[PDB]
Amino acid sequence: NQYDNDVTVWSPQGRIHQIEYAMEAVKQGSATVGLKSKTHAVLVALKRAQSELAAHQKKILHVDNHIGISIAGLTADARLLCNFMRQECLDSRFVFDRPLPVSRLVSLIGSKTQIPTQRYGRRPYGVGLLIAGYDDMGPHIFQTCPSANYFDCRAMSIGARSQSARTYLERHMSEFMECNLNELVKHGLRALRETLPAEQDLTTKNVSIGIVGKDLEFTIYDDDDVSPFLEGL
Amino acid sequence: SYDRAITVFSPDGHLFQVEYAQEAVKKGSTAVGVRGRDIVVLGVEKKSVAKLQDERTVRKICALDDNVCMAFAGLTADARIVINRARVECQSHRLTVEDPVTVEYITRYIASLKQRYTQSNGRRPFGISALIVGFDFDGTPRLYQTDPSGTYHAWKANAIGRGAKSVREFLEKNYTDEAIETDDLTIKLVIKALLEVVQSGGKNIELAVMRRDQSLKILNPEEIEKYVAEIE
Amino acid sequence: MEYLIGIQGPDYVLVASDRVAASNIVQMKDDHDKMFKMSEKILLLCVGEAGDTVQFAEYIQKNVQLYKMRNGYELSPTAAANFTRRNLADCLRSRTPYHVNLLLAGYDEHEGPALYYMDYLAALAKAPFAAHGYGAFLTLSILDRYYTPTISRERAVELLRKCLEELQKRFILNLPTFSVRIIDKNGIHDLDNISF
Amino acid sequence: TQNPMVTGTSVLGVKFEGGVVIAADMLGSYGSLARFRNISRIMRVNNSTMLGASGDYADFQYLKQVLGQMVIDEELLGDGHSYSPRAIHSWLTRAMYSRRSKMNPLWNTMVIGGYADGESFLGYVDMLGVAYEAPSLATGYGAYLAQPLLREVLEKQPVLSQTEARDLVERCMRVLYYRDARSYNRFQIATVTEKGVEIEGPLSTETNWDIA
Amino acid sequence: TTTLAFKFRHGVIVAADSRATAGAYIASQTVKKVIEINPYLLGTMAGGAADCSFWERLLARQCRIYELRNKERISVAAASKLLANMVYQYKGMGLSMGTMICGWDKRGPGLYYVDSEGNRISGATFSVGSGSVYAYGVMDRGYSYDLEVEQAYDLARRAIYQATYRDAYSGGAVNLYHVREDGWIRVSSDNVADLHEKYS
Amino acid sequence: SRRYDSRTTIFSPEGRLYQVEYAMEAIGHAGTCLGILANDGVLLAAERRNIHKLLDEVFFSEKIYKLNEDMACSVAGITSDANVLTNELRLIAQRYLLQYQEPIPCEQLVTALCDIKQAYTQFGGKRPFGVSLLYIGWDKHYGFQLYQSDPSGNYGGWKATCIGNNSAAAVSMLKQDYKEGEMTLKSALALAIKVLNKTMDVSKLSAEKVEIATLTRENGKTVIRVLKQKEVEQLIKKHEEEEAKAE
Amino acid sequence: FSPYVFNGGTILAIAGEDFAIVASDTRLSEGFSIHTRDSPKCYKLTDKTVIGCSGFHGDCLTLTKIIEARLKMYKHSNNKAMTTGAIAAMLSTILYSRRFFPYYVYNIIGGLDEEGKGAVYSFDPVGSYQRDSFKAGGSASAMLQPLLDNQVGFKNMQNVEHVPLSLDRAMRLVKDVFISAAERDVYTGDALRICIVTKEGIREETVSLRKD
Amino acid sequence: DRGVNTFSPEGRLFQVEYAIEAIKLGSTAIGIQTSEGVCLAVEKRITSPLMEPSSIEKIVEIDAHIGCAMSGLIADAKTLIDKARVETQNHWFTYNETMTVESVTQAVSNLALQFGEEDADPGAMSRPFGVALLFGGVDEKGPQLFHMDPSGTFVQCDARAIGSASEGAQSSLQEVYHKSMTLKEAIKSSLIILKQVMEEKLNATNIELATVQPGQNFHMFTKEELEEVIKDI
Amino acid sequence: GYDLSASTFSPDGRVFQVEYAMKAVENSSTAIGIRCKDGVVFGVEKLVLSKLYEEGSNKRLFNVDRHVGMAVAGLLADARSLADIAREEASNFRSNFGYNIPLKHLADRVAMYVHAYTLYSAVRPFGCSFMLGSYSVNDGAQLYMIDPSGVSYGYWGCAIGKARQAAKTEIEKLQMKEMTCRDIVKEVAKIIYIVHDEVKDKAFELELSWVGELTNGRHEIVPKDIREEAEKYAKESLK
Incomplete structure (x- = not known):
């Protein structure tokens, strides 16, 4: 009653309701799926039908040539957070002339996201990000939360009804590290399809695919480009 | 620095401090402006004369520039901040454009300032409305009205203050091209509209008329009784 | 250098200025107003560095016009000259000083005619007659010679004409035309340009 | 640094097949005074990067703690990402360039050597942010007195061995002791390989022949 | 560098040369020195080339912001005052400029010389640049206000021509523009080596 | 913190400013202060509050506070907040003299304080100054003047007005025994004592309970002169006797 | 302390009907010496744009870092690559933003325009900006x-x-004019990178010049 | 009682949730993107007959190629449509190119959710914007049309109605729109739907129409031009 | 309403926002650290929530300097914030004094940063306790622990987390003062498994890191050849 309006107020249970309510903002957005093999890292997202006449969203963003993100939650907090991530990746290539490592970008997010969770009159970033990457250490599926810790994932899905995808992903995660590129994306499409109503299916108009790889920069795939990936599902 | 959101939204999408600043306008003295063919007439309704006013310094029709003059209703102290900040902008515009302002320019400056205190931290909105009259360089007369929300519209005739719901109902049934034809008949259109709102009646109003170059002059008290006797 | 001259009479503040806007060797403009009216009854005659003479004079003009809007009455010439001195003096040690040499002239309904001198080092002085520029050297002794404090305004134009004929014969710059205007009690009247 | 105070002189550097060798003498001059005769002007940056600098030795000790602690900070989080020798050369290019634009330069003239991913890196950085890479480097009067000897060997034979590059290093350091007034008869040789940076001890040019 | 502008009855003719030179070595001879600002107003480039071409581009975006906010095109008076105020903030810092804003407003044809020294003055005729003194003479003999359109084209080409013939830093091709009441038009780009065959 | 804030500068749902209207009631229980404009001067007649037997007589007045060579004020409300305002008017009066070398016109001094007072009713989150205060003065443009300035930040020029306790009863007596364009100074001193009897609940006056200052012109120089104890005791006795000759 | 050094180098963009050819020498200099013989002054920006940068090499390294960083900022916020004329307009504002401590870089943009024709944009070091058909810098x-x-x-x-x-x-005509330049200019002559920009991408050649 | 940066237990961020309810009190605006141009049609909602209807500028120029249509609190739009105009001129200044319709929408919607009351600026927004904006124009990708909800969520739409009668005009836009209709057939379709939803009698005074073609610039219809269209309905 | 701010005492003199923030540590899994004769060994019961997380995500053992390690427990985003604060203090010490920061001083500089958020309504207290541990030749082995109140005490063994009291009884019967670091790792893994609940919180990955004389005073993760030889030892005595 009186412990949920401010982010600087602990409840008597050792718990901050304003942080947990911002994590409710990412569980009611749209389902996005991220997963990786030993060679690639794939972000698949549902471009959500706002109406029957809207070109739906854009929910996968370019960050660097080796890192792209996928958005669940408030979209204006996302690109406010993505413009920080784009600047932090330009900051390294200007200074070190090398790609900034994926595990160090997400550590800069979680230290920038923790700061509004502790000062008065500031709100948590109501956005979850699945982050695909290819560093010198391989592929990476970092998930970040409004509760500013982050998670190196083998595969992860966030958004509305995304537990059905995590039910799917945790079953078939035993075979992700030995897939082809077209085989790995189709696992993410079958995970993304699990988050759909029974009257709905994965068209080419509502699916974006973001792939990053070894000899492949990060690319998003539009409506006509997801047709070679949906040709088997 | 006092940084706290004073004007916030409410359920059903209302800004309470903007709505409550408009209730401060409705508790103020009634101001009427109509727009003629080559004449704009502002008239305010002095509620009390009291025989002890130095009336020179509670006049509610100011003069923003030589071509622009306004009349307000609402919190008198909030108006004097708006009147003075419009007068500074009318002089900065002569500095940079080498031309007098248009009436819609200083209306946009007053409205965007009034919008700014509905959205900045640590500020309440202005509790005034402003009937702004003037003339372009082309000579077209203008009549504008700003609200505490920061919204401004052009008007053929308008009324702000107390009783303005009844004065605007009067002017919407009596503003025609025939009553806006003669310059003296335009002046009696404000005086007829004010006398419907002045609950005590008589020569207890203030009224200023601005024609073209050889500009604005506020009418004297015996020069206003000549019109009120011509409408008795 | 450009040329200013003012002659205070009993009820007028006759001023004149050259109308040239010279550059390196060529001159650009031959009808150049160096007079800036501030009220209905006061003028500011401004010469000096390039650009400073309008960035200062229009700044003084916009605040003296703002004074009339805020208050309903105009400044006096003494208060306008003192206002003009303040924001010329507190900027002479700033990052951006103004190198303007001024000649403020005005009529007051109760104090009368008033002519003011000030230089780029912001020293205000009320004078019966004053002049600026290199041409002041040749003309301030025409005016120490034939000026009386009770001079008519017809004899002030005729005394002004003696000073401007002295510049035609003895001064090396080409200053052919001069804007001349009076500041009697009825405001500012543009007299005919004394040309050569 | 508007004016340098204690300067080092020429720093050599040449890459070979399997690594890079740099060399600098152990001396800092206060204006034709051999004042500090035992200072090492070669920094081991990390396991695959070495660094030697000419110019102001106080500005080089500033770079040894700013770049040295930057190597702590990457090694704390322990994710397996190290600075390459060309990442350090690019950071140090941006560090020296940002200082001349505030007109407060670091006076030094670093030579960065390194060996990462099977490839030898040798990089120059000047105090104006002028940076490049070369098979052989020499700063100071070594660019006049040793760089002609380095390039005449690297033109006939673009790949050296380790024993052959070290002998070429000592042969150019002997010429610097003969003909540079700010040079000194003791020098450090550092060598990066696949097995890490190894800075050998005080070597002399004590085989100096002077037929007068 | 020689730029030229005069007002006459049928608008204002703007003319310039094309030579941009660093020291005594001609860097280019196809320099568009008549900077068109927007479809109704335009300037010239005399002085530092990057200074005249930046601040008249920054003038160009503030005239467009003025046109969007006020729903009317800016005057020649207000445009020259905005340019004078922007370059006054860098007085004594090294802006080499000196330019002529041209156009029609409600007041008719307008021509205002604006310098980075701080000047902005009205006038019928102006000429800016190093060969401006050679262009002043040929202009002032031929100039009239009641000058025909083909006549005003002729003496503005020739005044730039005589300036290129005497100024080492003036050359290239003339670039004649004409401001009419419905915006400026570009009328000719005659080469100086081609005008020499006509003028002799 | 939003919990501890009181929101001093917001609107009421009726369109009111509470802290302004609550500052207005601090003044209605302060010392009664009135001012009367005459044809050759303006006066102030403050009812003295600090009338204890063991008070000293340090500085020139109790509630007058001369502002300028040519104008003085008089305060009623919070005593401490009035001292902050009167230092501020003296700064504005001397910044005008520094900038123009002419004395501040009296309407332009009241306007500048009323901008500082309005600014604490609109932004900053502070309480307003609970000081309404009168003004008497002379200037070139309109001569003798009289102003009143509420804590709202709005002011007015008056011929006769009154602030403080029983101000509403004092104004109505000034509506009837004041004549416009017909009040001399000596007639206005007698009107001041007449109002300060029916608006002070005590049996009579004693001149230890009032303070009077007049502002006149003498040979081109404004003099502001607090009347001494014998000068007011003669005015009390001229009204305590003349009331017996009217009943 | 001078914040500048002339590092030499000559750059040669040429526009055609369906191509652009940006060429440069590879010699880096300071004073009377040669830093390195393989340092191209030419830099690929997009699929159809090459910049050539000569002058002060500390500013040449910084400016191409800034352009390559602001190439990406356009692509992030506008979701398309920059055209050749928009790079050259952006460089006109980058070179003027640093005007009272300016870049000592002569720039020539060469690429394909938005209609598939060759485009060569020449630059003064403070951002004076002209489209030509050919330019040496x-x-x-x-x-x-x-x-x-x-x-x-x-x-x-x-x-x-x-x-x-x-x-x-x-x-x-590119190769024959650097042979004439390497004969009589002391700052040119190590090698000659030719970046030639067509519809199929940017081919990049090299040909030797006379070592000094 | 609660601050401006406070999430609902549903994760909705209250002040934005109430700024969306402010749009439903503003007049109805319609946009239709065709392949031959976009059209923007808005109800003016004349309050009094004495009000001059030429001052109700609910459609504005952003650049020559972009026009915007607003609904909600018209005073709040004037700071967004001035930041729209300055951003197009800053893009033209730097890049000598017209700014695309998506990136103007992306720049304006970054100002939404940039509010707060804890040192967000010396002058910062206390509250979100109570406006929806329909950007519409022709870029290098052709005719485009964008929506700008106060959450900073921007979406490309083929046809979109906003305002007090959007839920009911968006039901009418989904029935009559198709991907090959003409701009003349879209202007006419934007007035049958305004006829259903306006309270007063629809004439050429209480509507405001403007189109952006690929050939011509932005232009707003005159009084004489609107009279031809209303007779066709 | 005496518990909505950190600038408010209770009527019996308690700051509940501090005491609520240490309930957040008590809802986190148990991390222990044992100071022995040769060094300090940390151990974290790291609850892995989903099977979808990679082995090593949400790491609880930090390196704050090359000789100091940090085992955290509590709100993990606050823990990574204080790890950056402890890295900055250890960095600024070497940039101002030229040697490795003592663990006494580093623990006191960070505990006074934590204390600084227990005083104002503008911030909340940190929701994490954390142990620090280092080894030097001169200073020896040292283990300090910092609470969300900002109090730092030196320990021979600390056991922050859920099973705080249950792990302290296992550390108290150990006699760590004479045992070496390779013997403590076999015992830390025993204490982690005996306090883990195999009913409430299901999956968990043991994280172990020492700092001691065998590493020349460097803090590092215990290697998998020694880690697996202690997890096998811990299950054999769990029976």
Whole structure:
């Protein structure tokens, strides 16, 4: 009653309701799926039908040539957070002339996201990000939360009804590290399809695919480009 | 620095401090402006004369520039901040454009300032409305009205203050091209509209008329009784 | 250098200025107003560095016009000259000083005619007659010679004409035309340009 | 640094097949005074990067703690990402360039050597942010007195061995002791390989022949 | 560098040369020195080339912001005052400029010389640049206000021509523009080596 | 913190400013202060509050506070907040003299304080100054003047007005025994004592309970002169006797 | 302390009907010496744009880091690559943003325009900005521009047919004019990178010049 | 009682949730993107007959190629449509190119959710914007049309109605729109739907129409031009 | 309403926002650290929530300097914030004094940063306790622990987390003062498994890191050849 309006107020249970309510903002957005093999890292997202006449969203963003993100939650907090991530990746290539490592970008997010969770009159970033990457250490599926810790994932899905995808992903995660590129994306499409109503299916108009790889920069795939990936599902 | 959101939204999408600043306008003295063919007439309704006013310094029709003059209703102290900040902008515009302002320019400056205190931290909105009259360089007369929300519209005739719901109902049934034809008949259109709102009646109003170059002059008290006797 | 001259009479503040806007060797403009009216009854005659003479004079003009809007009455010439001195003096040690040499002239309904001198080092002085520029050297002794404090305004134009004929014969710059205007009690009247 | 105070002189550097060798003498001059005769002007940056600098030795000790602690900070989080020798050369290019634009330069003239991913890196950085890479480097009067000897060997034979590059290093350091007034008869040789940076001890040019 | 502008009855003719030179070595001879600002107003480039071409581009975006906010095109008076105020903030810092804003407003044809020294003055005729003194003479003999359109084209080409013939830093091709009441038009780009065959 | 804030500068749902209207009631229980404009001067007649037997007589007045060579004020409300305002008017009066070398016109001094007072009713989150205060003065443009300035930040020029306790009863007596364009100074001193009897609940006056200052012109120089104890005791006795000759 | 050094280098963009050819030497200098013999002044920006940068090499390294960083900022916020004329307009504002401590870099943009024709944009170090058909910049620019204005502009030729410049006649005209530049300019002559920009991408050649 | 940066237990961020309810009190605006141009049609909602209807500028120029249509609190739009105009001129200044319709929408919607009351600026927004904006124009990708909800969520739409009668005009836009209709057939379709939803009698005074073609610039219809269209309905 | 701010005492003199923030540590899994004769060994019961997380995500053992390690427990985003604060203090010490920061001083500089958020309504207290541990030749082995109140005490063994009291009884019967670091790792893994609940919180990955004389005073993760030889030892005595 009186412990949920401010982010600087602990409840008597050792718990901050304003942080947990911002994590409710990412569980009611749209389902996005991220997963990786030993060679690639794939972000698949549902471009959500706002109406029957809207070109739906854009929910996968370019960050660097080796890192792209996928958005669940408030979209204006996302690109406010993505413009920080784009600047932090330009900051390294200007200074070190090398790609900034994926595990160090997400550590800069979680230290920038923790700061509004502790000062008065500031709100948590109501956005979850699945982050695909290819560093010198391989592929990476970092998930970040409004509760500013982050998670190196083998595969992860966030958004509305995304537990059905995590039910799917945790079953078939035993075979992700030995897939082809077209085989790995189709696992993410079958995970993304699990988050759909029974009257709905994965068209080419509502699916974006973001792939990053070894000899492949990060690319998003539009409506006509997801047709070679949906040709088997 | 006092940084706290004073004007916030409410359920059903209302800004309470903007709505409550408009209730401060409705508790103020009634101001009427109509727009003629080559004449704009502002008239305010002095509620009390009291025989002890130095009336020179509670006049509610100011003069923003030589071509622009306004009349307000609402919190008198909030108006004097708006009147003075419009007068500074009318002089900065002569500095940079080498031309007098248009009436819609200083209306946009007053409205965007009034919008700014509905959205900045640590500020309440202005509790005034402003009937702004003037003339372009082309000579077209203008009549504008700003609200505490920061919204401004052009008007053929308008009324702000107390009783303005009844004065605007009067002017919407009596503003025609025939009553806006003669310059003296335009002046009696404000005086007829004010006398419907002045609950005590008589020569207890203030009224200023601005024609073209050889500009604005506020009418004297015996020069206003000549019109009120011509409408008795 | 450009040329200013003012002659205070009993009820007028006759001023004149050259109308040239010279550059390196060529001159650009031959009808150049160096007079800036501030009220209905006061003028500011401004010469000096390039650009400073309008960035200062229009700044003084916009605040003296703002004074009339805020208050309903105009400044006096003494208060306008003192206002003009303040924001010329507190900027002479700033990052951006103004190198303007001024000649403020005005009529007051109760104090009368008033002519003011000030230089780029912001020293205000009320004078019966004053002049600026290199041409002041040749003309301030025409005016120490034939000026009386009770001079008519017809004899002030005729005394002004003696000073401007002295510049035609003895001064090396080409200053052919001069804007001349009076500041009697009825405001500012543009007299005919004394040309050569 | 508007004016340098204690300067080092020429720093050599040449890459070979399997690594890079740099060399600098152990001396800092206060204006034709051999004042500090035992200072090492070669920094081991990390396991695959070495660094030697000419110019102001106080500005080089500033770079040894700013770049040295930057190597702590990457090694704390322990994710397996190290600075390459060309990442350090690019950071140090941006560090020296940002200082001349505030007109407060670091006076030094670093030579960065390194060996990462099977490839030898040798990089120059000047105090104006002028940076490049070369098979052989020499700063100071070594660019006049040793760089002609380095390039005449690297033109006939673009790949050296380790024993052959070290002998070429000592042969150019002997010429610097003969003909540079700010040079000194003791020098450090550092060598990066696949097995890490190894800075050998005080070597002399004590085989100096002077037929007068 | 020689730029030229005069007002006459049928608008204002703007003319310039094309030579941009660093020291005594001609860097280019196809320099568009008549900077068109927007479809109704335009300037010239005399002085530092990057200074005249930046601040008249920054003038160009503030005239467009003025046109969007006020729903009317800016005057020649207000445009020259905005340019004078922007370059006054860098007085004594090294802006080499000196330019002529041209156009029609409600007041008719307008021509205002604006310098980075701080000047902005009205006038019928102006000429800016190093060969401006050679262009002043040929202009002032031929100039009239009641000058025909083909006549005003002729003496503005020739005044730039005589300036290129005497100024080492003036050359290239003339670039004649004409401001009419419905915006400026570009009328000719005659080469100086081609005008020499006509003028002799 | 939003919990501890009181929101001093917001609107009421009726369109009111509470802290302004609550500052207005601090003044209605302060010392009664009135001012009367005459044809050759303006006066102030403050009812003295600090009338204890063991008070000293340090500085020139109790509630007058001369502002300028040519104008003085008089305060009623919070005593401490009035001292902050009167230092501020003296700064504005001397910044005008520094900038123009002419004395501040009296309407332009009241306007500048009323901008500082309005600014604490609109932004900053502070309480307003609970000081309404009168003004008497002379200037070139309109001569003798009289102003009143509420804590709202709005002011007015008056011929006769009154602030403080029983101000509403004092104004109505000034509506009837004041004549416009017909009040001399000596007639206005007698009107001041007449109002300060029916608006002070005590049996009579004693001149230890009032303070009077007049502002006149003498040979081109404004003099502001607090009347001494014998000068007011003669005015009390001229009204305590003349009331017996009217009943 | 001077914040500048002239590092030499000459750059040679040439526009054609369906191509652009940006060329440079590879010698880096300071004073009377040679830093390295393989340092190209040419930099690929997009799929159809090459910049050539000569002057102060500390500013040349910084400016191409800034352009390559602001190439990406456009692509992030506008979701398309920059056109050749928009890079050259952006560089005009980057060079003027640092005007009271300016870059000592002569820049030539060469690429394909938005209609598939060749586009060459020339720059003063403070951002004066002109589209040409051919431009030399740098140390030998006074040597190269009279031959380019002879053999491309067809100037001072009487009764000669203005043939369209082919791809091969332009490439020989590039190579033959640096042979004339390396003969008499001391700052040019190590090698010659030619970045040639067509519809199929950016081919990049090299050919030797006379070592000093 | 609660601050401006406070999430609902549903994760909705209250002040934005109430700024969306402010749009439903503003007049109805319609946009239709066709392949031959976009059209923007808005109800003016004349309050009094004495009000001059030429001052109700609910459609504005952003650049020559972009026009915007607003609904909600018209005073709040004037700071967004001035930041729209300055951003197009800053893009033209730097890049000598017209700014695309998506990136103007992306720049304006970054100002939504940039509010707060804890040192967000010396002058910062206390509250979100109570406006929806329909950007519409022709870029290098052709005719485009964008929506700008106060959450900073921007979406490309083929046809979109906003305002007090959007839920009911968006039901009418989904029935009559198709991907090959003409701009003349879209202007006419934007007035049958305004006829259903306006309270007063629809004439050429209480509507405001403007189109952006690929050939011509932005232009707003005159009084004489609107009279031809209303007779066709 | 005496518990909505950190600038408010209770009527019996308690700051509940501090005491609520240490309930957040008590809802986190148990991390222990044992100071022995040769060094300090940390051990974290790291609850892995989903099977979808990679082995090593949400790491609880930090390196704050090359000789100091940090085992955290509590709100993990606050823990990574204080790890950056402890890295900055250890960095600024070497940039101002030229040697490795003592663990006494580093623990006191960070505990006074934590204390600084227990005083104002503008911030909340940190929701994490954390142990620090280092080894030097001169200073020896040292283990300090910092609470969300900002109090730092030196320990021979600390056991922050859920099973705080249950792990302290296992550390108290150990006699760590004479045992070496390779013997403590076999015992830390025993204490982690005996306090883990195999009913409430299901999956968990043991994280172990020492700092001691065998590493020349460097803090590092215990290697998998020694880690697996202690997890096998811990299950054999769990029976």
